[PDB]
Amino acid sequence: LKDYALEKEKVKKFLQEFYQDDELGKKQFKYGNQLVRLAHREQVALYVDLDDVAEDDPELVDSICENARRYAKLFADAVQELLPQYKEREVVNKDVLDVYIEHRLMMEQRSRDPGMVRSPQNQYPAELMRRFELYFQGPSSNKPRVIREVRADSVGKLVTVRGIVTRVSEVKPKMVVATYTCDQCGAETYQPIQSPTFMPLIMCPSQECQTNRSGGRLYLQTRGSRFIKFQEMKMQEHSDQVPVGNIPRSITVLVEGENTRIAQPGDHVSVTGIFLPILRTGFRQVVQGLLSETYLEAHRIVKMNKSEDDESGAGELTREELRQIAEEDFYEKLAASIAPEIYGHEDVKKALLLLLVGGVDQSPRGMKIRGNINICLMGDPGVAKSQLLSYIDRLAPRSQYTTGRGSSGVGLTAAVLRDSVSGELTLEGGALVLADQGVCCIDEFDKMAEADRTAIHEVMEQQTISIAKAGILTTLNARCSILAAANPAYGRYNPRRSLEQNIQLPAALLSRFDLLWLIQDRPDRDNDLRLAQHITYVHQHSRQPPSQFEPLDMKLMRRYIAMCREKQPMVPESLADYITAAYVEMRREAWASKDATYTSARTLLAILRLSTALARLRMVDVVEKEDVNEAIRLMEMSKDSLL
Amino acid sequence: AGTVVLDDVELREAQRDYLDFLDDEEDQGIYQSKVRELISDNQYRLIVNVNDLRRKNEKRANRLLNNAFEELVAFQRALKDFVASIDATYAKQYEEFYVGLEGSFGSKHVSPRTLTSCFLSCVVCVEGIVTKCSLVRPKVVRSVHYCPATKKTIERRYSDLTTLVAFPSSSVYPTKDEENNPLETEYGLSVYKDHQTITIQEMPEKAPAGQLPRSVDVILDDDLVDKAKPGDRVQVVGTYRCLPGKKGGYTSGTFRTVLIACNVKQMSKDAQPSFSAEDIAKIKKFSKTRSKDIFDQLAKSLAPSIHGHDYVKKAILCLLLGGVERDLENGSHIRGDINILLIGDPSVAKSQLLRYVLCTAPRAIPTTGRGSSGVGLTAAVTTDQETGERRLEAGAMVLADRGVVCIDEFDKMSDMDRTAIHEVMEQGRVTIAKAGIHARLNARCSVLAAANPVYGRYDQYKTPMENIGLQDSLLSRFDLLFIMLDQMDPEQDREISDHVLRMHRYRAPGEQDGDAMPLGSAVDILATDDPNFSQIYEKHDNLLHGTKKKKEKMVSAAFMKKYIHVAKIIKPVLTQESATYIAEEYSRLRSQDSMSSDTARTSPVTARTLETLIRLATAHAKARMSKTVDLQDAEEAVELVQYAYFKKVLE
DNA sequence: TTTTTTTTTTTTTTTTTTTTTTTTTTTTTTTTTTTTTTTTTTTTTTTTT
DNA sequence: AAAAAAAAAAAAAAAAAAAAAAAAAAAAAAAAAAAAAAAAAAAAAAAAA
Numbered sequence A: 001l002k003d004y005a006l007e008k009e010k011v012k013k014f015l016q017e018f019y020q021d022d023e024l025g026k027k028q029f030k031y032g033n034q035l036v037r038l039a040h041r042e043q044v045a046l047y048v049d050l051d052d053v054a055e056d057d058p059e060l061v062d063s064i065c066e067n068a069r070r071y072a073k074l075f076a077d078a079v080q081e082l083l084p085q086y087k088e089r090e091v092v093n094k095d096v097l098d099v100y101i102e103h104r105l106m107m108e109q110r111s112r113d114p115g116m117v118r119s120p121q122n123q124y125p126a127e128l129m130r131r132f133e134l135y136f137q138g139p140s141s142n143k144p145r146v147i148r149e150v151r152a153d154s155v156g157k158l159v160t161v162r163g164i165v166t167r168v169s170e171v172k173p174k175m176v177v178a179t180y181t182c183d184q185c186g187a188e189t190y191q192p193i194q195s196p197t198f199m200p201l202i203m204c205p206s207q208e209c210q211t212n213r214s215g216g217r218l219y220l221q222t223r224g225s226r227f228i229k230f231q232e233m234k235m236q237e238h239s240d241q242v243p244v245g246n247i248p249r250s251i252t253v254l255v256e257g258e259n260t261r262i263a264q265p266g267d268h269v270s271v272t273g274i275f276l277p278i279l280r281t282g283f284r285q286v287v288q289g290l291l292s293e294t295y296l297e298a299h300r301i302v303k304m305n306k307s308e309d310d311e312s313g314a315g316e317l318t319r320e321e322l323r324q325i326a327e328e329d330f331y332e333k334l335a336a337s338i339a340p341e342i343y344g345h346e347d348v349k350k351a352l353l354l355l356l357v358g359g360v361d362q363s364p365r366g367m368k369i370r371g372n373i374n375i376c377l378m379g380d381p382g383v384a385k386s387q388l389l390s391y392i393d394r395l396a397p398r399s400q401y402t403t404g405r406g407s408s409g410v411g412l413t414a415a416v417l418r419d420s421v422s423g424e425l426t427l428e429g430g431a432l433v434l435a436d437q438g439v440c441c442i443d444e445f446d447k448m449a450e451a452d453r454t455a456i457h458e459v460m461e462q463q464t465i466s467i468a469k470a471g472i473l474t475t476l477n478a479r480c481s482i483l484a485a486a487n488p489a490y491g492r493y494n495p496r497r498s499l500e501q502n503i504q505l506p507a508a509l510l511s512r513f514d515l516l517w518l519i520q521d522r523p524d525r526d527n528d529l530r531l532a533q534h535i536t537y538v539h540q541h542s543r544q545p546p547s548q549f550e551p552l553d554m555k556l557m558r559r560y561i562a563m564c565r566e567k568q569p570m571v572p573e574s575l576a577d578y579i580t581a582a583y584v585e586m587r588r589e590a591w592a593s594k595d596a597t598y599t600s601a602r603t604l605l606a607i608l609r610l611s612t613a614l615a616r617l618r619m620v621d622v623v624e625k626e627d628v629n630e631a632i633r634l635m636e637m638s639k640d641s642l643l
Numbered sequence B: 001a002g003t004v005v006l007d008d009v010e011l012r013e014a015q016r017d018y019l020d021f022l023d024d025e026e027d028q029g030i031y032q033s034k035v036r037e038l039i040s041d042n043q044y045r046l047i048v049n050v051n052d053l054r055r056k057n058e059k060r061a062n063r064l065l066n067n068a069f070e071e072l073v074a075f076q077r078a079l080k081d082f083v084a085s086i087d088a089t090y091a092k093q094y095e096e097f098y099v100g101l102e103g104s105f106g107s108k109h110v111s112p113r114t115l116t117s118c119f120l121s122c123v124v125c126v127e128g129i130v131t132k133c134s135l136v137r138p139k140v141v142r143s144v145h146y147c148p149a150t151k152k153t154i155e156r157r158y159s160d161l162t163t164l165v166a167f168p169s170s171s172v173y174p175t176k177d178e179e180n181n182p183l184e185t186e187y188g189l190s191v192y193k194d195h196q197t198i199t200i201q202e203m204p205e206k207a208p209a210g211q212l213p214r215s216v217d218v219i220l221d222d223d224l225v226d227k228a229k230p231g232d233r234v235q236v237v238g239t240y241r242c243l244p245g246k247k248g249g250y251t252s253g254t255f256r257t258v259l260i261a262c263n264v265k266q267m268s269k270d271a272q273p274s275f276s277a278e279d280i281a282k283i284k285k286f287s288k289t290r291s292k293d294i295f296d297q298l299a300k301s302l303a304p305s306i307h308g309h310d311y312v313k314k315a316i317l318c319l320l321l322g323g324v325e326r327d328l329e330n331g332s333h334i335r336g337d338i339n340i341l342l343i344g345d346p347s348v349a350k351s352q353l354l355r356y357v358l359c360t361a362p363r364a365i366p367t368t369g370r371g372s373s374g375v376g377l378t379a380a381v382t383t384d385q386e387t388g389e390r391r392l393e394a395g396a397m398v399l400a401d402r403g404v405v406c407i408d409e410f411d412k413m414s415d416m417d418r419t420a421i422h423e424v425m426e427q428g429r430v431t432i433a434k435a436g437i438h439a440r441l442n443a444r445c446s447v448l449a450a451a452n453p454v455y456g457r458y459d460q461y462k463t464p465m466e467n468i469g470l471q472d473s474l475l476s477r478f479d480l481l482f483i484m485l486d487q488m489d490p491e492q493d494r495e496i497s498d499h500v501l502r503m504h505r506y507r508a509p510g511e512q513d514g515d516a517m518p519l520g521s522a523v524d525i526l527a528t529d530d531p532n533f534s535q536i537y538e539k540h541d542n543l544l545h546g547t548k549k550k551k552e553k554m555v556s557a558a559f560m561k562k563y564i565h566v567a568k569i570i571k572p573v574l575t576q577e578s579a580t581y582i583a584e585e586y587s588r589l590r591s592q593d594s595m596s597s598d599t600a601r602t603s604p605v606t607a608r609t610l611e612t613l614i615r616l617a618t619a620h621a622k623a624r625m626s627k628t629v630d631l632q633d634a635e636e637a638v639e640l641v642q643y644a645y646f647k648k649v650l651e
Numbered sequence C: 001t002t003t004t005t006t007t008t009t010t011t012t013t014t015t016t017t018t019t020t021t022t023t024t025t026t027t028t029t030t031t032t033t034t035t036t037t038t039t040t041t042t043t044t045t046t047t048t049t
Numbered sequence D: 001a002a003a004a005a006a007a008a009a010a011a012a013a014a015a016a017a018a019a020a021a022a023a024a025a026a027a028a029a030a031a032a033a034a035a036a037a038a039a040a041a042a043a044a045a046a047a048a049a
């Protein structure tokens, strides 16, 4: 229907004279600069934002979104033609593929014969000599689609979907152009690969071996060939977009090139790409017809909404965030912003913020002490333990939420599972691995299987998982902080029994928890009325009642916490005696009493990492005495409910 | 050889008959309206009741039920003509308009067991349960190619030869130009329709007991694909056909048969009800005319065969109506589902209340204490075993999403199962994970459970804690707990025995004529239509042997179903007077000194009790169709909670 | 309610059969057509009294 | 003027090679599926104050 020479001129015109004031208001050619950067081989990926294209040619954006594979090819053609005139120096040949490109180009010039018309097969395939790769960023005027509803009517179209990443293969080399050499001639043979399989060539087709009518067997080699970083992921529907009685649907996303190594399993992502078929020929197909599988050829992969990425590299922000972080009540404001719909539990929220920020990991002369804070909320029924855990799951960047026994066994640990790219046995992690450097919220901790409690022992202290079962012999790597929620021994605290007889945790597991918080709800008229007013306001308006400080948005909380995270403070010597005295005093009162939990050196280490976290929240580089004071006070408030 | 049919007399007559049946404008234009309606909401399949066709043209009806593809292609030509007449632009926007069939199939109503070879190429209705769905695959129906060498663009069409002979030239995908120039396919310009194969098994409760089940393969084409999922009880109407084998040279004479669906439908209990304008007028009249005591009128009319338990019936109405889910901006969730537990003495009609809600409520799932075990109750994770991948399997409480799980003998359920349902009973979701897959399935259900106390019978002289053998964590998420007690009072016995004996004497009018026995045996079911997928409604029941006589009527079951469906959608908003009353009420409930001595707590009072005060008040307001939660609603909620949460211990 | 043996039971495969599908594949005669002869039926230049 | 000749010269019949056309044409191997059974890990219910 349409003429692609004119479309190529259109996309050339867009690339050459589109400008924006992004550089601090200075008017830059957004894509000409990148053509410069990738003509000098300083850049590989060119993300063509289609919002930019739509500013001056919405019909082009419609055509792109309707074919989306013709236009990716057109854009690659156009940029490849524009690169020579944007090259202002000579590339340093940073790579080994670059040497092959340079030798091929130089040989082609050397035997040029510019006026002689060479065969269509006597040329280098375009894909063999590109070194860049071009991707679309979907127009924002396209509303994201739901994985279930991306069907045959959108094959070939550019669509945007979002879901949880459930499974990512390892990055492995996918052949793009298979290069062969001959045993007779000295020409190279190229076989661009489009299918998932290919039959390697046997005889060479070069001009010399045809003239000579020689054998000319050709040999497949990796050295001149083109591979691309390839990776296959499975992405899954979000829970709040599944039909009522249904399970979430998956989609295969084929990720190649510079989009690899972005998504990890557990990530919430938005993927823009072309919905494309794979011919699926070969089977003993029941039905006649050209049936095919489907996949999303990823163009843009964006983590989001709990695993947001770009803010991390954008730590520089407004003067405001400077002024709130500088404020003295910043710690109180961040603590209050944790689940504002839950009323009360101010100190619990302070401790939870400490778990999110965490302490500093020590590595002294090969004896690792982990800076993770593990917290257990040992509480009465209906005191909002699960709500706090679910909130912390929605907040923390790498967080997995686990209730009683749905995620038991290999749902926490790893399992060996078959792959598809290589058909061998890959290792897949469970909740403790999917939360490797984040939080794992274990709800109903007390009703957990004993094997899983043992695994949690070894995770909490050594921060690994040792498996020596039949198919698996590995030490997984689980650097997570455990946020546990449990009920006392008989579902409710019994003041007639002893504290550890209510906790029903062994001393070893009880010591694994830096802060173990008792939450009792004794009735009382004033506090019950206040709690009821808060709850009824939340029901009435879907928001917490207004207070003096507006709670921070969960994006701001993530950014503030992440900005705190890279702030390793050191305990000074001037605090050594103060900390030691606090620990000794705490230790003495532990056995002076008859209603105290197990206390050990881990209690000191808990003081020390809690105070390090508190110092970190103030963005200081040394721990002060107020941090140690706040750590001590939180440690007493953990059991304050007993009084 | 390529010929065209200059004149097919049969095709002409068939198309004329079908267009005549569809025009319908003189005969109260039902299909006229149906076609304009599918044009309106942008569909391209018309569901045609074969009873209407049998009325208008019986000869077509027989020909269509017996020669399915010929007649269906004629009828789809006629339908495209009709759509083009009504709207030519919409008609050109779709290449094909399909006709699905509906209604009563006499002997063409089968199960996967009785679907035999005497039905090949006939339209059949098959009922069963989905055992496996395939992936939804696109099948190319029109491939567009571009030759960069010559700038030419070609297109190649592929007819649906699924059940017809396919010669190998029919399925060649063009890769080269005639000059052997490489073609490249235009995926966004090519046309693909999506394709899916399911297997329908004979329903386990319909199959002969002890025999292995029988299945049928079913083909689903575009817009019919995602209509069923494994474990669904569906009705599939289609053509029964023998699939072509692969070009051989020797054949064993055996053909794979398959059902090519022309319509798929679910259990009609779970479908959106049809609402004639008179029905909406009647609902508005009901709600507006009787507003103070409408809730009690609906409640006492709930399970008419069960005498008494009026508070239990009010609570069950609240469960059927539900609170309103809160969806906070930060993603936090508060449930609007009401969970009810009945503990009682033997034979106090609590299994009967569970069964009534099973009959009445949409998406109600049964279960007994040990009939479901964890994985069978919540979801499961299995491995596909043919692709090597993890697969999620929905259990009872996922299938009951936006529905009810009616758990009976809840006490005899194992402790691990109740631990498993803790998370569903409050968060309305099932968190499940093996290592290759993790998911958070939606299970937004309300649990109606029946249990027996420890020792089988309730002990009046023991604390309800010592008598209900459940812990405060499990009890507290049951937001209403009713001790249904067998008191052997003689006047109560008068009342109950009278009611029961009166229910054991009633004959259904007309159907029963004096001595009839109801049963039918394994053929009589397929003889007539299924009252599970089948397509003037009064308001009050007429007086009969159910009741003697008085100045208070009985809401009809059908009207109550329609009314509850309408009222369930309402989202009454809590007012400030209601909020203050509920807050102070809850604060008073928590403080024990307000409640007498010798009166124990059946279940603990927590913040969940406040949430359930709100939920019950909201459900009451829904019943009145208020759009606001007024003080009467809050009072009814508080009195229900007050009745449920305390029991008098005797001595 | 901490410890402990049968029980499956989901997952790895392996077997393993039965059935459907796949893969492989020039030579040899015959016949029309054209271009030749060849006997016979004319027919067109030879001469006489 | 006709009477022998003595060729064309047309036909039927033959040959007579070509050069093209026409006519013959299952069994052996594989794979996939669906079903089994088996080693291992995992999840149940009987034990006692």
Ligand SMILES: Nc1ncnc2c1ncn2[C@@H]1O[C@H](COP(=O)(O)OP(=O)(O)OP(=O)(O)O)[C@@H](O)[C@H]1O
Binding pocket: A341, A342, A343, A344, A379, A380, A381, A382, A383, A384, A385, A386, A387, A388, A486, A487, A531, A535, B333, B334, B335, B426, B473, B607, B608, B611
């Ligand atoms: N302090 C509170 N503020 C706001 N809401 C609360 C509070 N306490 C309880 N709730 C409400 O009560 C409901 C139950 O809370 P949740 O399920 O978190 O209890 P839980 O601590 O998990 O109890 P269990 O130990 O039984 O699991 C939630 O909807 C929550 O909103």
Ligand SMILES: Nc1ncnc2c1ncn2[C@@H]1O[C@H](COP(=O)(O)OP(=O)(O)OP(=O)(O)O)[C@@H](O)[C@H]1O
Binding pocket: B305, B306, B307, B308, B344, B345, B346, B347, B348, B349, B350, B351, B352, B353, B450, B451, B452, B496, B499, B500
């Ligand atoms: N109040 C009542 N009104 C009408 N019928 C009743 C009543 N009480 C008992 N019945 C009759 O008793 C019979 C048994 O009732 P059901 O099976 O529901 O008892 P149950 O409470 O479930 O007993 P269990 O607790 O032992 O399971 C039913 O057929 C029911 O009709």
Ligand SMILES: [Mg+2]
Binding pocket: A385, A386, A443, A444, A485
């Ligand atoms: Mg909880």
Ligand SMILES: [Mg+2]
Binding pocket: B350, B351, B408, B450
């Ligand atoms: Mg019962």
Ligand SMILES: [Zn+2]
Binding pocket: A182, A183, A184, A185, A186, A187, A204, A206, A208, A209, A216
């Ligand atoms: Zn060669």
